[PDB]
């Protein structure tokens, strides 16, 4: 019932479940935290910005890797108007045989890609599932830099 | 071990084990005292 809202002693003394709920919803309101100065505020915001950019780059790297690994980017290059892009494969134990058959695309059940990443990456000059892997590797390196 | 075994190795791992340990840690942390 203590020590969770480390940034707020008023919440940490709450004997109810409201402390847990308000601890989540006030975690990023740095200006309202206990023992707070402006320098610490700007420094924490700066570090949070770095972590956020790292998260964005990791998300993009994950999209690239999953298109390279479980997608049909190379097949889509040769026939972009008939082949439907694949986002990533599906492994869900709750599937029946009918669901597996219906979601089956090429070798495994997979989700069609509605993000338009296939067309975007094709336009900027990507033609191989090894070009996407290089992008994922580089973006994970950039995320490490930002962290 | 082929690459197609990775989903069956990772999806249960992440989607069940990570919730369990994360719940353990979060409950322990939010139920601490001083």
């Amino acid at each position: 019932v203590y020590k969770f809202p480390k940034f707020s002693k008023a919440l940490a003394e709450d004997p109810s479940t409201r402390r847990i709920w308000y601890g989540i919803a006030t975690a990023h309101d740095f200006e309202s935290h206990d023992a707070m100065t402006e320098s610490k505020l700007y420094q924490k915001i700066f570090a949070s910005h770095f972590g956020h950019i790292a998260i964005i780059f990791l998300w993009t790297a994950g999209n690239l890797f999953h298109v390279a690994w479980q997608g049909n980017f190379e097949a889509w290059i040769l026939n972009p108007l008939k082949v439907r892009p694949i986002a990533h494969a599906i492994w869900d134990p709750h599937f029946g045989q009918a669901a597996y058959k219906a979601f089956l695309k090429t070798s495994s059940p997979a989700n069609l890609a509605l993000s338009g990443v296939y067309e975007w990456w094709y336009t900027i000059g990507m033609r191989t599932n090894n070009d996407l892997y290089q992008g994922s590797f580089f973006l994970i390196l950039l995320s490490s830099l930002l962290l | 071990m082929s690459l197609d075994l990775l989903p069956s190795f990772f999806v249960p791992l992440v989607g069940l084990v990570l919730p369990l340990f994360s719940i353990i840690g979060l409950f322990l942390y939010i139920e601490k005292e001083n």
Binding site: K6, A47, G51, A54, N129, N130, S136, F137 | S2
Partner: peptide, 30 residues
């Protein structure tokens, strides 16, 4: 089709990015 080595080293590099993330997470304090 990417190889096992390609996926494995990407997983290893992802682990390194994870240790860098907790270091940033712990440095942003409890």
């Amino acid at each position: 089709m990417i190889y096992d080595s390609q996926v494995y080293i990407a997983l290893v590099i992802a682990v390194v990015a994870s240790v860098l993330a907790i270091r940033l997470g712990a440095t942003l304090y409890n």
